[PDB]
Every structure is written in structure tokens, then in C-alpha cells.
Design a protein around this ligand. Structure first.
Ligand SMILES: *Cc1cc2c(cc1C)nc1c(=O)[nH]c(=O)nc-1n2C[C@H](O)[C@H](O)[C@H](O)COP(=O)(O)OP(=O)(O)OC[C@H]1O[C@@H](n2cnc3c(N)ncnc32)[C@H](O)[C@@H]1O
Ligand SMILES: C/C=C/CC/C=C/CC/C=C/CCCCCCC(=O)OC[C@H](COP(=O)(O)OCCN)OC(=O)CCCCCCC/C=C/C/C=C/CCC
Ligand SMILES: C/C=C/CC/C=C/CC/C=C/CCCCCCC(=O)OC[C@H](COP(=O)(O)OCCN)OC(=O)CCCCCCC/C=C/C/C=C/CCC
Ligand code: HEM
Ligand SMILES: COC1=C(OC)C(=O)C(CC=C(C)C)=C(C)C1=O
Ligand code: SF4
Ligand code: F3S
Ligand code: FES
Lengths: 102, 138, 613, 239
């Protein structure tokens, strides 16, 4: 049968190592590219993360279903908001930089 | 009777009864690992909240990032506060980062022994502090 | 009464006890297609067989060439000829198939380089009929064979439709006109009463070592099954032959497998002598349990103890490679440390002969059917079987050969299931039951439930244990024995002055431990009485008055010109005991031991010879 | 004279309106055994025989003792009492479980869970079973050491926060490790289907590698280390 649970588990580890290689990468080479992939991994990883906290603590078909739904929203508005920022603004990298020499 | 029917019987019997649940978190002995497990969540949660707040703010609030920064520069920013706030942000990120590396190593199936466990915990804790103070001055 | 509503269940067969024997009997009955119920007062896996460490005997021939017949010989001899040879034939011939069955079920046996079950040396087991040398047929799972045997059997049982009544206390057999109709039990969870009736009942309730003060057995070994048979007016056999195990920590009485000795370890007295070489040259440290302990127990008398009060001895393993004690005796290293605080790899363990196994129990057929004695003849009790330590098919006779009990468990557990499968069909008419069947049991329950007497259950039990410990130990004599009988019959009287405190319906361990006391008493009465009457020395039963092996003939010298003593003139016979539940009066009789095997051509009878290792 | 104080959880199902509470007992350690179970048995036989708890082997291999002693799940019969008369021992039932009475928990779900992984040997061809001993090199056999010694006491599972919150769908350490026991037995032929049974979000994946299970096993075993081995197998088996 399908190995959905197992694949999702691996998926998480993968973006976990990816988001691990990005932080350094983004320091050594700040650029618009980095700011996007950094937004992708940052939001995905976080989406799957809160996901686990939800399935863990929210008991009931009613609630979990909703919770998962509201989580997806927050994630969507989060990735979009970050991409907006990278487009119509400084970009997370330069924002961090700026924010630091302050 | 099957495994499933046995489970159904179990819940039907206990939920509908005056049987109390024995205490847990209130009595179980805290351990470094258990504590560091909690913090991983807490930080992951706090960290995600921050990132979301940065992205949503970028969509609803007016002005560019600079309008926001200059906005803070002219806020009497005390040096022994700009560093504090800068540390508070670096702390949970670093902790979660190092502990996360530890978590990954475990998935490879390494270091899963009580002895090895405490060592790595101490290490992860030390690296946290170092990289935090370190970054709060970069 | 009727304050306890009763629930009526109906099955094809019922098994009381989920130890090795019970478990094997239960799933074997289901595997055969019978709607089987299995009543146990403990979670199956908590059963005593889990504590078993040694191994299970079987002439598989993995270590060297072997012959189950040599296993047969060794066993009948080790019984001091009080063992029924037909049953011993059945057991040793079936052993190989029974052990391979366990391995095929998934038992994680320790392996050899050929990838076969690893077997090892053990107490008095030879080759070529006591001529070919030390044998190696003790199959084992490291040092936790019992634990693994019970778990794999339990696991295997999950595969079938057997209804397991967990944590249910069997009160009495449902008897009707000399025929068994099932059992009546107390559901410990809610205090309710259940009458599980069936066409066949199998009793595999274990032994009753707890009748004593110091024993290797669990707090749950209370002879509850023996007591039921006794309450039905049925006989119990050879209850006097109580096996004292050599190695038992001076402390709590916990056991250190005899496998230690078979693996290489030795026994040492205070002076440092390997006495088990003085009392028995050839077999030495690795001889019959009854002799080896009789030795040590003696050395303590001469004044050669190995600790403060010089009351015990010292088991050694030190000279064995630290790795070997890790691959062969890892289980004893743990408890040796935990209960003694020792590093076996560099120090000998403190052991002392303590009660261990019960050869006596419910009289059985080699097919597991319970026997009663009528006009000096055996008679099968319709719909009633027994197997395991609680049973006395008597394959152990006057003395159990080490590693033969786990075998017994599996073999006769299977035999019971097979005799039922071969004698009837699932769905057959399940016997009627009077609407008041079990009333006596419930009343006795209700009685102790609210007992407002003067003696505390624990107080009484303690009186019985220390009395047995002092009057019926490794050595005995009429004086010491008779004082014990009246001493124990006195305590039996006190069962009416007992005080209980807990009075709820849920988990009344107060009530059950008391019910268990009633059971332990019936067993002690039969043990001490049958012991006083047996004026001879055979196997574990050693009398100072009579250090003789009184047989039909004098098997030392020749036989032909000699005359055969009348049956009631010798002691080569099983003791049958009864007791008036109401007065505690012990009456006893005897029946012959079976000497013929199942087939002279395939396995010859072994005539009584002189006892020696 | 050496008096030791004992605070013990209590609750009578047959005492209308009773509510969980601690009852303290005192015991002269010179008139007692070295283990916690000895104390329990002692206050059971002399002070209050209404004190209920499971026990049997008092040797540490049956698993009947499982209970929380001073914040830790272990075996009362192996955990030696703290001779520090200044400290008062705290005995509670296994964590987050329905109490039937006093120190006695309902382990029905626990057992049921064990049954669901089919803890027995499964061959594709059972037509020849019972006639010959299956072969297994001592190498393949060593892989079971540390797995088969499980006593099923439930200390581990009952110490896992994930089992505390989702014990209904999360199998727990104890069961997971036995499933692993069967997964790596060279003689079993259903490895692939045993892993497939864990393809959902609860059975296995509620484990977040907290490690309390391993940190509390009375037998020094390592459930967590085994849960991780299953996880690796789960992400690399084919079909
Ligand atoms: C004590 C002991 C014995 C032992 C051993 C180690 C120890 C510490 N090591 C052995 C070894 O290495 N090799 C060997 O050949 N024998 C060894 N032994 C002796 C042997 O293990 C025992 O004789 C045997 O295990 C007894 O098995 P059996 O199946 O007959 O009995 P049990 O496991 O003790 O289980 C009793 C069952 O009956 C149920 N029960 C008891 N009373 C009731 C009541 N009243 N109502 C309902 N059920 C009841 C129990 O719950 C249990 O399931
Ligand atoms: C998402 C929203 C992010 C804003 C929230 C807060 C700040 C994040 C804390 C990270 C601290 C990074 C350390 C500072 C730093 O390296 O800047 C200096 C350097 C320039 O000096 P330089 O040394 O002169 O130039 C570098 C040499 N080429 O900076 C760079 O140019 C590299 C920046 C890379 C930052 C990594 C992304 C981290 C993700 C933040 C996560 C979320 C929690 C909130
Ligand atoms: C005032 C204006 C008047 C009209 C406006 C209308 C309302 C929209 C609300 C509908 C919510 C439906 C819930 C169904 C659901 O759970 O879908 C699953 C899916 C996820 O796929 P999934 O495959 O279950 O999960 C993906 C997680 N990776 O859930 C969602 O898409 C939730 C969307 C919520 C948006 C707010
Ligand atoms: C330095 C890079 C990072 C690494 C290596 C990393 C690694 C991990 C790992 C391995 C886990 C799984 C833990 C488990 O098994 O339960 C995890 C969980 C999580 N992470 Fe990260 N992470 C990183 C950065 C971040 C960031 C920046 C955020 C914030 C947006 C975040 C938020 C979370 C959350 C919310 C969880 C869920 C924890 C839970 O299951 O309760 N992580 N991370
Ligand atoms: C991350 O895993 C953990 C939890 O989630 C399952 C907890 O709730 C908790 C509990 C905290 C409060 C006291 C209920 C702990 C300690 C933990 O380690
Ligand atoms: S692993 Fe350890 S704690 Fe968990 S039941 Fe098996 S014995 Fe107990
Ligand atoms: S505590 Fe649990 S969460 Fe995993 S490691 Fe042990 S199963
Ligand atoms: S009673 Fe058996 S393990 Fe503690």
C-alpha cells in the first residue's frame, strides 16, 4: 500500500537539512535567490512543525480538521508575505543585515 | 475477541466510570532530556510565530522595512538593550538549531543511549550560549 | 449469597491457568477447533514459568548423537522408581517434537555454529543408559528460557479465538455425580461470580511452594488447583515429595539456575572443599537435586557455613570466562547483584537449599486425565484433566530431573488438548448444571469477605510456613513430623478465627490472599501427613528413622530366590491423600506405580536398581 | 530503630465519594526487606491489608510491580528503599492510566496494543511447521539480544508523554520494540507487512524521540533506540 506517513517523515528531515544548509549559505552569499528559497524552507518546515504539534494536542475530528485548516492559512499568508517582502522590499537577508548594524 | 474490539471495550468501560487518571507531569521526575525536549517545541513554536509575524506584517502594515527601522532608531535605543533584544532573538534560534542537529543525528540512529544522551545535551547547551553571545555581537 | 449476582458462560473446554501448561493446553484446544475458555488470576505472562532459567530437555542430538531413550532412562532413574514409566516414555519420546514446535513458534533459542538449537549439560543426564558419559540435551534461550517459553506461547495464543478470563480467581470445580462440568470463579475486577461450564476442564494451576517460609517460587504459587481437587473429594498424589533446590539466595529465596553448575560453576563450603565430589564422585556438583541439596544441608550441620551465622554455602562461577557468564548466565548475574550484590565474574554467589518444585499434585493418566481410586483401581474422572506442576502424571516420581518441568508443561499441555480432541467433538452437548451449583463456594467467599475474627490472614499464613519449614524440611523423623502434623492441624482449626479488613468488591487482595491461605492449608496437611506415614527414604523424602529404600524386593542383591513383599508391606507406591474440608482430617491410601512402558519393543522397562550418583 | 516514611496514593472504588489521596505509613527498616515491594507487603500484612497492588515473582522478571516510585517508573521489587530517613518515599500508580483501585492500573489497552502487532512467528509456508527446527546463525540470533528480554511491565510506555496524550492510537515504546523484535527475526517472513501496519500518523510517528522510555526501563533495554531503527526501515523498505 501507499507509504504516505513514512514519506512525509523523510520529507521533514530533508527540508530540515536544507534549512540547515541555507542559514550559512545565506550569510556567505546574500542574494535575492537565497531570500526566496530561505522563505520556502522556512515556511514549509514551520508548517510541518506546527502540524505535528497540532495532531499531538488537538483531540477530535471537529477541531483537528479546523486547526489543520487555519494552520494552512497562516502558512500561506506567511509565504506570500515573505515573497512580497523579497519583491517589493529589501529582502529578508538585507533586512537581517540592516537590522544588525543598528 | 479481537485487538480492536478489546480497545473499544477499554474505552467504553473507562470513560463511562468514576475511575480517576493517575497523575503524570505533576509527579514524574524531570530530566535534562525531557526538559530539552520541551524547549525544542517551545522554541520551534516561538520561532514560527516570529516568522509569521514578519510575513503578515509585510502584507498588512504600511511602509517599507526602513520606515520601520528608522522608526526604532529614533526610540532612544539603549545599547544595553539593543544587545538584549538581539540576544533574545538569537537564543531560541540557536538552541533550536543545535538541538535540531542533534535530532537529525538521532534519526540516523546514533547517540541513543542514556550516557551519550546527557553528553550531547550538555554540548548542545554550551554551543547555544556560545553562538548566541557570539551572534549578538556580529 | 445472591448478593453476588452470578454470570453463566458456556464453552467446550475450560483451562485454569495460563502458565506454560495452561497456555499450551488452551491454544492447543482452540487450534483443534474447540470453543475454549482460559481462566487465570494473573496476566498470562506473569505466570511463574517466566522465572524459569535453566532450559527444556529434548534428545535433539544437536551437540552430539543422542537417543530419547537415554533421556527416558535418566528420568525413570532420577525418580527413584516412583515414576510411572509409561508417562516418562510418552514425555521423552515427544520431547524432540515438542521443542521443535516451540522453536517453530518463534522461541528465540540460543544457537550453535550449525544454526541449530543450542543445548547444554544438566543435573544427572547421561549417554548410553548411564554409561556413555555426560549428556547435552538441555535446550535453552540464554538464561531466560522460561520467560521466553511463556512469552512465545502467549504470543502464539493471540492467533486464536480462545476467550481469556484475565485476573479471575477459580474458586472450585463444578462437580456433578463424579463428573466435571466446569469451574466457578471470582472476577477480581468487579467482585462478580462466574460459572464457566464446559464438557472438559483442564487444571494447570502450578505448585504450592508458598506453603513454606523460604521458597524460590512466586507469591502466587498457592496450590489453588490442588485445593479444588481436594474440595471435590478427589485424591492428591505424593504431596510429601517436595523438591529442595540447592542454590537459593540466603535472602528472599530467589533462584540461581542449576544451569550455572552445568555451565561450569561449582559449590564450595566454608573450609573451601568441593564437597559435591565427596558425597558423589562421578556426578559431583551436577547430580540429582534431591541428593545435591541433602549434601549441603548436611555440611551446614557439621558447622561449615560461609557467612555470619554459617547457615548457608557459596556457589562459585568466578573461574568461568566473563563472556560465558554473559552469554550463558546473564539472568543470574543481574539478580545475583540486585539481591546479593555480587559480580559473578569475580565472586561466588551465596546460595542455600530452599523449597523449589512440587512433584506431587492431581493424580493423572499419561493422557492428562485425572484419576480417582476405586476398589484399589484407577478410574478416569469424566471431563477432568490436569497438567504441569499441579499435576502428578508423575513423570518426576520421587525426584524431578532438572529441565524436565518445562518439558512436562509443553508435553502434557498438548496431551490434554489431544485427548479431548480425540475423545469428543466441538459443539457436543455441554452437561447441565443445578441452578445452585457453586453455592458453597460463594458462601465461603462471602464468609471470609466479612471475617471479623481475631487472627490476621498474614499471621496465620506465617504460622503455617514456619511450621512446615521446621517440621518438613530436607530432613525428617517421626517426632519432628508428628509434632508438625498436630501443629499444622491446629492452625487449620484457626481458619475460623481469622480477621480480614478490606471489604469492597474491587481488587480485594485481602479476600483472595485469604482464599489462597485456605488452599495452602489443604496442601500442607497432605504434605506433612503423607510425609510422616512414609517410612522409607526415596528421592527428596529422606527419613532419619528409615534411611532405607523399601521396595517390593531388595534390588541390591539378586532377584529370584527372594520373596516379594505384600503391596501394603513396602513403600514403592504413590501416596493418595484426602481431607475432610470441614475438620481437616487427613485420610490416605496408595496405588501402584506403573512400570510398563507404552511399548516394550520400543522402550524397555527399567527395573529398580540402587540409587546413586 | 530506623523509621522510614511512606507516602502512598490511594483510591477506593467501593467507597462512595472517595477521591484520590495520599496516605502516609511508617516502617522500621530493620524489620523489613531492602526493596520497596518488601515495604508494601509489610504494611500490607501488618498495618493495612486494604492496600492493593500487583506482585508475584518479587525477582524482577514477571513485570507485575510496575509503578511510579519517587517520580520514576520501575519495579517495586528491584528498587531498593532510600535509607535516608529524612526523605519520604512517594509511591504512585503508573502515570496517565485509569486506576482500578490504589496502585492497580488498567493495562487492557496496553495488552490490546501488543496483540495488534501480531507478536508471533509468521512463515509464508506453515505446512511444514513442527517437524524440523528452523536454522538461524548465531549472528542472526544476536540481533534479538536486548529486544526479547522485555517483561511487558509497561514502565516505558507509561513514561512517554506521547503515550500520555495519545495512548489510544499511539502504540507506545513497549509495543513498538516488540514489533521491531519480530521485524528483524531472520525466521519471520512478514517484515514488509509488519512495517506497512505502521503507515499512518499515530502508531509509530507520535514518537518525538523524548527518550524517557529508555531512561526508565527496569531491565536496561532501549525502546527509543529501537523506535529509531523502525523509522529507518520505514523510510527505506520497498513496495
Ligand atoms: C520457581 C521456579 C521454577 C522453575 C525455574 C525457575 C524458578 C524461579 N526454572 C526451571 C528451569 O529452568 N527448567 C525446568 O525444567 N523447570 C524450571 N522450573 C520449574 C517449572 O518452571 C515450573 O514447575 C513450571 O513453570 C510450572 O508451570 P505451570 O504452567 O504448571 O504453572 P505456573 O506457570 O506456575 O502458572 C500457574 C497458572 O495458573 C493460574 N492460576 C493459579 N491459581 C489460580 C486460580 N486460583 N485461579 C485462576 N488461575 C489460577 C495462574 O494465574 C497461572 O497462569
Ligand atoms: C525571517 C525574518 C528575519 C528577521 C527577523 C530577525 C533577525 C534574524 C536573526 C539572525 C541573525 C543572523 C546574524 C546577523 C548577520 O549575520 O548579519 C550580518 C551580515 C552582513 O554583515 P557582513 O559580515 O558585512 O556581510 C557578510 C559577509 N558577506 O548579514 C548578512 O548579510 C547575512 C544574513 C543572513 C541571515 C540568515 C537568515 C536567518 C533566518 C531568520 C529566522 C527566524 C526567526 C525570527
Ligand atoms: C465573507 C465572504 C463570504 C464567502 C467566503 C467563503 C469560505 C471558505 C471556508 C471553507 C473551509 C472548508 C474546509 C474543508 C477542508 O478542511 O479542506 C481541506 C483543505 C486542505 O487540504 P489537505 O490535503 O487536507 O491538507 C494539506 C496540508 N498540507 O483545507 C483548506 O483548504 C482550508 C482552507 C481555509 C481557508 C480559510
Ligand atoms: C537551523 C535550522 C533548523 C534545523 C536543523 C531544524 C530542525 C528541526 C528538527 C530536526 C525538528 C524535528 C524534531 C522532532 O523530531 O520532534 C524540528 C521541528 C520544528 N522546527 Fe525546526 N529546525 C531549524 C529551524 C527552524 C526555524 C527557523 C523554525 C521557525 C520557523 C523552526 C520551527 C520548528 C517547529 C515549529 C518544529 C516542530 C517541533 C515539534 O514537533 O513540536 N525550525 N526542527
Ligand atoms: C515534547 O514532548 C513533550 C510533550 O508533548 C508530548 C509534553 O506535553 C510535555 C509536558 C508538560 C506539561 C507539564 C504537561 C513534555 C514534558 C514533553 O517532553
Ligand atoms: S522495554 Fe523495558 S519498560 Fe518498556 S515493558 Fe519492556 S521491560 Fe518494561
Ligand atoms: S519516550 Fe517516547 S516519544 Fe519516543 S523515545 Fe521513548 S517512545
Ligand atoms: S513482582 Fe514480579 S517483577 Fe516485581
Amino acid at each position: 500500500s501507499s507509504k504516505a506517513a513514512s514519506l512525509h517523515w523523510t520529507g521533514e528531515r530533508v527540508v530540515s537539512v536544507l534549512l540547515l544548509g541555507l542559514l550559512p549559505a545565506a550569510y556567505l552569499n546574500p542574494c535575492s535567490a537565497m531570500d526566496y528559497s530561505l522563505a520556502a524552507a522556512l515556511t514549509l518546515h514551520g508548517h510541518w512543525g506546527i502540524g505535528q504539534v497540532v495532531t499531538d494536542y488537538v483531540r477530535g475530528d471537529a477541531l483537528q480538521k479546523a486547526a489543520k485548516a487555519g494552520l494552512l492559512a497562516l502558512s500561506a499568508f506567511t509565504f506570500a508575505g515573505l515573497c512580497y517582502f523579497n519583491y517589493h522590499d529589501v529582502g529578508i537577508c538585507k533586512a537581517v543585515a540592516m537590522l544588525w548594524k543598528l | 475477541t479481537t485487538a480492536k474490539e478489546e480497545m473499544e471495550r477499554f474505552w467504553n468501560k473507562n470513560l463511562g466510570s468514576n475511575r480517576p487518571l493517575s497523575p503524570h507531569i505533576t509527579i514524574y521526575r524531570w530530566s535534562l532530556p525531557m526538559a530539552m525536549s520541551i524547549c525544542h517545541r517551545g522554541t520551534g513554536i516561538a520561532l514560527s510565530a516570529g516568522v509569521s509575524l514578519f510575513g503578515l506584517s509585510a502584507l498588512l502594515l504600511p511602509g517599507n522595512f526602513e520606515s520601520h527601522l528608522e522608526l526604532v532608531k529614533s526610540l532612544c535605543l539603549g545599547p544595553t538593550l539593543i544587545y538584549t533584544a538581539k540576544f533574545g532573538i538569537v537564543f531560541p534560534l540557536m538552541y533550536h538549531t543545535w538541538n535540531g542537529i542533534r535530532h537529525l543525528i538521532w534519526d540516523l540512529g546514533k547517540g541513543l543511549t542514556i550516557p551519550q544522551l546527557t553528553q550531547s545535551g550538555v554540548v548542545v547547551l554550551i554551543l547555544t550560549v556560545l553562538s548566541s553571545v557570539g551572534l549578538a555581537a556580529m | 449469597s445472591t448478593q453476588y449476582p452470578v454470570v453463566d458462560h458456556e464453552f467446550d473446554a475450560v483451562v485454569v491457568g495460563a502458565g506454560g501448561a495452561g497456555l499450551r493446553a488452551a491454544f492447543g484446544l482452540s487450534e483443534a477447533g474447540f470453543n475454549t475458555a482460559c481462566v487465570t488470576k494473573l496476566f498470562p505472562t506473569r505466570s511463574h514459568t517466566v522465572a524459569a532459567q535453566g532450559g527444556i530437555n529434548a534428545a535433539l542430538g544437536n551437540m552430539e548423537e543422542d537417543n530419547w531413550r537415554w533421556h527416558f532412562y535418566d528420568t525413570v532413574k532420577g525418580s527413584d522408581w516412583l515414576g510411572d514409566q509409561d508417562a516418562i516414555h510418552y514425555m521423552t519420546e515427544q520431547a524432540p517434537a515438542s521443542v521443535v514446535e516451540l522453536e517453530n513458534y518463534g522461541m528465540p533459542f540460543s544457537r550453535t555454529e550449525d544454526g541449530k538449537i543450542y543445548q547444554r549439560a544438566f543435573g544427572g543426564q547421561s549417554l548410553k543408559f548411564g554409561k556413555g558419559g555426560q549428556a547435552h540435551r538441555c535446550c535453552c534461550v540464554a538464561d531466560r528460557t522460561g520467560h521466553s517459553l511463556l512469552h512465545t506461547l502467549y504470543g502464539r495464543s493471540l492467533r486464536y479465538d480462545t476467550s481469556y478470563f484475565v485476573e479471575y480467581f477459580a474458586l472450585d470445580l463444578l462437580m456433578e455425580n463424579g463428573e466435571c462440568r466446569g469451574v466457578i470463579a471470582l472476577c477480581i475486577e468487579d467482585g462478580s461470580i462466574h460459572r464457566i461450564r464446559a464438557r472438559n476442564t483442564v487444571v494447570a494451576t502450578g505448585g504450592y511452594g508458598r506453603t513454606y517460609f523460604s521458597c524460590t517460587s512466586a507469591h502466587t504459587s498457592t496450590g489453588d488447583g490442588t485445593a479444588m481437587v481436594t474440595r471435590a473429594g478427589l485424591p492428591c498424589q505424593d504431596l510429601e515429595f517436595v523438591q529442595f533446590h540447592p542454590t537459593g539466595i540466603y535472602g528472599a529465596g530467589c533462584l540461581i539456575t542449576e544451569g550455572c553448575r552445568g555451565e561450569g560453576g561449582i559449590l564450595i563450603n566454608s573450609q573451601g572443599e568441593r564437597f559435591m565430589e565427596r558425597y558423589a564422585p562421578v556426578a559431583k556438583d551436577l547430580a540429582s537435586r534431591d541428593v545435591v541439596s541433602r549434601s549441603m544441608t548436611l555440611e551446614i550441620r557439621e558447622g561449615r557455613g560461609c557467612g555470619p551465622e554459617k547457615d548457608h554455602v557459596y556457589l562459585q562461577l568466578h573461574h568461568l570466562p566473563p563472556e560465558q557468564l554473559a552469554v550463558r548466565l546473564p539472568g543470574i548475574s543481574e539478580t545475583a547483584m540486585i539481591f546479593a550484590g555480587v559480580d559473578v565474574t569475580k565472586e561466588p554467589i551465596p546460595v542455600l537449599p530452599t523449597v523449589h518444585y512440587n512433584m506431587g499434585g492431581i493424580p493423572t493418566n499419561y493422557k492428562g486425565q485425572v484419576l480417582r481410586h476405586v476398589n484399589g483401581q484407577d478410574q478416569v474422572v469424566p471431563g477432568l484433566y490436569a497438567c504441569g506442576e499441579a499435576a502428578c502424571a508423575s513423570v518426576h516420581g520421587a525426584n524431578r530431573l532438572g529441565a524436565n518441568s518445562l518439558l512436562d508443561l509443553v508435553v502434557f499441555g498438548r496431551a490434554c488438548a489431544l485427548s479431548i480432541a480425540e475423545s469428543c467433538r466441538p459443539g457436543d452437548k455441554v452437561p447441565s448444571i443445578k441452578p445452585n451449583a457453586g453455592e458453597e463456594s460463594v458462601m465461603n467467599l462471602d464468609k471470609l469477605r466479612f471475617a471479623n475474627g481475631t487472627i490476621r490472614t498474614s499471621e496465620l499464613r506465617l504460622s503455617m510456613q514456619k511450621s512446615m519449614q521446621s517440621h518438613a524440611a530436607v530432613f525428617r523423623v517421626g517426632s519432628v513430623l508428628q509434632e508438625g502434623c498436630e501443629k499444622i492441624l491446629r492452625l487449620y482449626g484457626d481458619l475460623q478465627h481469622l480477621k480480614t479488613f478490606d471489604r469492597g468488591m474491587v481488587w480485594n487482595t485481602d479476600l483472595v490472599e485469604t482464599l489462597e491461605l485456605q488452599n495452602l492449608m489443604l496442601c500442607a496437611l497432605q504434605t506433612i501427613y503423607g510425609a510422616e506415614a512414609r517410612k522409607e527414604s526415596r528421592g527428596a523424602h529422606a527419613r532419619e528413622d528409615f534411611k532405607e529404600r523399601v521396595d517390593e524386593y531388595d534390588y541390591s542383591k539378586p532377584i529370584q530366590g527372594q520373596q516379594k513383599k505384600p503391596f501394603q508391606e513396602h513403600w514403592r507406591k504413590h501416596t493418595l491423600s484426602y481431607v475432610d474440608v470441614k475438620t481437616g482430617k487427613v485420610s490416605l491410601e496408595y496405588r501402584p506405580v506403573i512400570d510398563k512402558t507404552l511399548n516394550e519393543a520400543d522402550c524397555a522397562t527399567v527395573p529398580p536398581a540402587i540409587r546413586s550418583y | 530503630p530506623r523509621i522510614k516514611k511512606f507516602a502512598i496514593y490511594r483510591w477506593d472504588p467501593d467507597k462512595t465519594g472517595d477521591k484520590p489521596h495520599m496516605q502516609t505509613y511508617e516502617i522500621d527498616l530493620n524489620n523489613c526487606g531492602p526493596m520497596v515491594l518488601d515495604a508494601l507487603i509489610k504494611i500490607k500484612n501488618e498495618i493495612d491489608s486494604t492496600l492493593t497492588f500487583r506482585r508475584s515473582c518479587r525477582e524482577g522478571i514477571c513485570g507485575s510491580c510496575a509503578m511510579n516510585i519517587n517520580g520514576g517508573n520501575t519495579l517495586a521489587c528491584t528498587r531498593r528503599i532510600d535509607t535516608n530517613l529524612d526523605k519520604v518515599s512517594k509511591i504512585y500508580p503508573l502515570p496517565h492510566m485509569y486506576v482500578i483501585k490504589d496502585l492497580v492500573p488498567d493495562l487492557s489497552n496496553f495488552y490490546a496494543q501488543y496483540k495488534s502487532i501480531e507478536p508471533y512467528l509468521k512463515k509464508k509456508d506453515e505446512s511444514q511447521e513442527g517437524k524440523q527446527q528452523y536454522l538461524q546463525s548465531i549472528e542472526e540470533r544476536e540481533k534479538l539480544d536486548g529486544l526479547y528480554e522485555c517483561i511487558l511491565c509497561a514502565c516505558c510506555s507509561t513514561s512517554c508523554p506521547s503515550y500520555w496524550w495519545n495512548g489510544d492510537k499511539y502504540l507506545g515504546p513497549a509495543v513498538l520494540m516488540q514489533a521491531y523484535r519480530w521485524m528483524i527475526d531472520s525466521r519471520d517472513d512478514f517484515t514488509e507487512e509488519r512495517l506497512a501496519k505502521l503507515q499512518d500518523p499515530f502508531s509509530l510517528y507520535r514518537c518525538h524521540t523524548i527518550m524517557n522510555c529508555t531512561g526508565t526501563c527496569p531491565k536496561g533495554l532501549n525502546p527509543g533506540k529501537a523506535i529509531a531503527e523502525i523509522k529507518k526501515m520505514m523510510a527505506t523498505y520497498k513496495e
